[PDB]
């Protein structure tokens, strides 16, 4: 009986195996835009993805992860709220069964159709596994998706999904450029939080961009053809793989912009 997103194993049950689910800095949260104070001390955010090297894409039974070779100093996030440098290891999405839901963070309670998470580890800790033992081990860049015009840079992801339909399937996925997934503006909100799937560890400086990207209805429909089940098991469509907003517990959300 493993964790998932269903009635008997979903977010409301996670705390039994992962008591930190009720911790002091859980994610996602609702971003109340009126009360996220502008912080002029935030230096500009630096997203440097030139020469990033993707390796593989994996259906892990919850979402799909595009994994990067993080053995060298390339694909880094720095500046903004961050001290030091954080190295990209993977990205993935959360999405809905319907366009009206799917994101994890919300903006004045608004849910977007999906949300992209680019996961990075603080290089001072040597690798991801040691970084997740630290309260400043991770930085996740979150990007909202709305349904409208297609995002051309997403298409190469969409087109490999048929080859990883079910849990445990993976495929070679080299030379994918995540710069094609980024909106124009780097204006953001930031706050201290956690991973949003088990083990829910409280390592993350969250950086959530204000500007969504647009993807087409057809692109998100192909996300919704993935399966949570493994091959040869009854088909359960991979949809609504988002955790709802969690209590803020007096954390402050800061805005990079006026
Ligand atoms: Zn995520």
From Swiss-Prot:
It catalyses: hydrogencarbonate + H(+) = CO2 + H2O; urea = cyanamide + H2O. Its main location: cytoplasm. The record marks 5, 60, 65 as: Fine-tunes the proton-transfer properties of H-64. Changing residue 199 to A: Normal CO(2) hydrase activity, but impaired stability. The active site is at residue 62. Its cofactor is Zn(2+); Co(2+). Changing residue 3 to A: Impaired activity, not rescued by 4-methylimidazole (4-MI). Changing residue 104 to D: Normal CO(2) hydrase activity. GO terms for cellular component: apical part of cell; cytoplasm; cytosol; extracellular exosome; myelin sheath; plasma membrane. The keyword Cytoplasm applies. Changing residue 65 to H: Enhanced proton transfer. Zinc. Can also use cobalt(II) with lower efficiency, but not copper(II), nickel(II) and manganese(II). Changing residue 197 to H: Higher affinity for bicarbonate. Enhanced proton transfer capacity. Target of drugs used in treatments against glaucoma disorder and breast cancer. It is linked to Osteopetrosis, autosomal recessive 3: A rare genetic disease characterized by abnormally dense bone, due to defective resorption of immature bone. Osteopetrosis occurs in two forms: a severe autosomal recessive form occurring in utero, infancy, or childhood, and a benign autosomal dominant form occurring in adolescence or adulthood. Recessive osteopetrosis commonly manifests in early infancy with macrocephaly, feeding difficulties, evolving blindness and deafness, bone marrow failure, severe anemia, and hepatosplenomegaly. Belongs to the alpha-carbonic anhydrase family. PANTHER family: CARBONIC ANHYDRASE, CARBONIC ANHYDRASE 2. This is Carbonic anhydrase 2.
């Amino acid at each position: 009986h493993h964790w998932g997103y269903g009635k008997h194993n979903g977010p409301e049950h996670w705390h039994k195996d992962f008591p930190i689910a009720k911790g002091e800095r859980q994610s996602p949260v609702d971003i109340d835009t009126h009360t996220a104070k502008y912080d002029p001390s935030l230096k500009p955010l630096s997203v440097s993805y030139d020469q990033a090297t993707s390796l593989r894409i994996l259906n892990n039974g919850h979402a799909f992860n595009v994994e990067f070779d993080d053995s060298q100093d390339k694909a880094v996030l720095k500046g903004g709220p961050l001290d030091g440098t954080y190295r990209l290891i993977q990205f993935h999405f959360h999405w809905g069964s319907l366009d009206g839901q799917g994101s994890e963070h919300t903006v004045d309670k608004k849910k977007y159709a999906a949300e992209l998470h680019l996961v990075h580890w603080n290089t001072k800790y040597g690798d991801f596994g040691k970084a997740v033992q630290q309260p400043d081990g991770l930085a996740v860049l979150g990007i909202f998706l709305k349904v409208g015009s297609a995002k051309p840079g997403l298409q190469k992801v969409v087109d490999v999904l048929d080859s990883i339909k079910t849990k445990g399937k993976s495929a070679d996925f080299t030379n994918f450029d995540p710069r094609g997934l980024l909106p124009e503006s780097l204006d953001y909100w930031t706050y201290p939080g956690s991973l949003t799937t088990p083990p829910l560890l409280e390592c993350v400086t969250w950086i959530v961009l204000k500007e969504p990207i647009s993807v087409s209805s057809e692109q998100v429909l192909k996300f919704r053809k993935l399966n949570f089940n493994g091959e040869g098991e009854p088909e359960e469509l991979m949809v609504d793989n988002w955790r709802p907003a969690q209590p803020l517990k007096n954390r402050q959300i800061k805005a990079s912009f006026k």
